[PDB]
Design a protein around this ligand. Sequence first.
Ligand code: HEC
Ligand code: HEC
Ligand code: HEC
Ligand code: HEC
Lengths: 79, 80, 80, 79
Amino acid sequence: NEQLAKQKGCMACHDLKAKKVGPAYADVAKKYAGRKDAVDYLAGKIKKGGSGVWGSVPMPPQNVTDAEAKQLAQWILSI
Amino acid sequence: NEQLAKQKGCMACHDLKAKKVGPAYADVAKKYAGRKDAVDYLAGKIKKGGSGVWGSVPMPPQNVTDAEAKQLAQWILSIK
Amino acid sequence: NEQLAKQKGCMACHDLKAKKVGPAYADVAKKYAGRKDAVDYLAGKIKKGGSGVWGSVPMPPQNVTDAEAKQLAQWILSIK
Amino acid sequence: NEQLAKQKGCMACHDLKAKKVGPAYADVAKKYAGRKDAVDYLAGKIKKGGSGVWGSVPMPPQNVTDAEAKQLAQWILSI
Ligand code: HEC
Ligand code: HEC
Ligand code: HEC
Ligand code: HEC
């Protein structure tokens, strides 16, 4: 949920609507919602980070567990 | 409010009156006093950071919600 | 002390009990409780940061004097 | 002063004794104290940043006035 995103520092680089560092959470939801295994995909990206999907700036790996990454993916996709 | 600003780590770089890494809060309050869109303007600056208004060193973006950014903006603008 | 910790920005990444970006203070206290040289060890880590103890995310170095690092270490150790 | 250094965020990368990001202040004092124009030289580096003198990691420019840069240099040199 949003409280968890805040607790894990996600909002430093992601706003719900504005572009900061990574994509707006509302934009991620638009891209992936309804797509097969969107939750599992996004959970992996949240924990491990990555580059090249939204731009050339990498997202670093994050101090989140698998269960946390899944909760955050579920929350994001619900926007 | 002040405790929120301290909790978020804003005082690592800002003081009420002293010039640290970023501008004093009182100096931000003075600069934007009376501007109709000061809260919304500063809220965005608090969320996103920025450069070039006060100096050449950029402020990093901040781990805040829209509601928190609004509260911090309102608090800052209240400083005499 | 807690207020120093907040002022320096430590609470941006650490909570007393919750697991944020860095380990909870209570968990640090538990791990190093009764270890001699705990204070000197944690002071070093507060000044210099590091990684690999709690996760693969590095803690950045911190804007603290050696005296402040030792104060913050002693406060963290007391969280039990 | 050590108080102005902390106030300006300098201690995040510099310790008096230990190596963090930039050189320990005690080591900078050893290299420059008693050299011609050491205050002006260091003040310029403090305000404008630089790289290659102590290693390959650049120091960024700093939000300090000229007076603050010269006071910081004088303090460092006294160590
Ligand atoms: C900067 C230091 C970041 C932090 C902290 C977090 N994120 Fe991130 N994120 C960032 C960038 C630059 C990008 C785009 C990477 C790219 O491939 O272009 C992202 C991306 C995401 C995504 C979408 C990934 C995808 O493959 O589509 C998600 C779902 C995401 N980020 C979530 C997220 C969470 C939950 C975070 C806190 C644990 C988090 N990010 C932190 C930059 C940064
Ligand atoms: C350094 C690591 C900072 C932290 C942490 C915070 N701020 Fe900041 N801030 C910093 C600088 C170097 C600047 C000047 C940027 C520039 O344009 O020259 C700022 C600026 C602000 C402002 C003024 C914005 C403007 O006038 O356009 C505000 C209102 C502000 N900062 C607030 C703020 C808050 C609430 C913070 C914690 C959530 C915060 N800052 C952290 C450096 C740093
Ligand atoms: C994120 C930008 C952080 C800030 C700001 C602070 N800390 Fe931190 N800390 C962070 C991480 C990611 C970790 C884990 C590092 C690892 O080894 O995996 C830590 C760790 C600590 C520790 C424990 C060190 C150890 O057991 O070896 C302590 C005692 C600690 N942090 C204290 C501390 C203080 C006092 C801070 C303000 C000066 C501070 N931290 C800021 C992330 C971040
Ligand atoms: C990292 C984000 C830094 C901050 C903040 C400050 N300094 Fe720095 N400094 C840093 C590095 C990596 C280096 C070495 C650069 C190189 O050429 O190898 C330095 C260097 C200095 C020096 C010596 C300069 C020289 O010998 O040419 C001084 C005197 C110095 N730094 C002082 C200083 C002050 C006063 C700061 C706060 C205003 C400050 N530094 C911040 C990294 C970083």
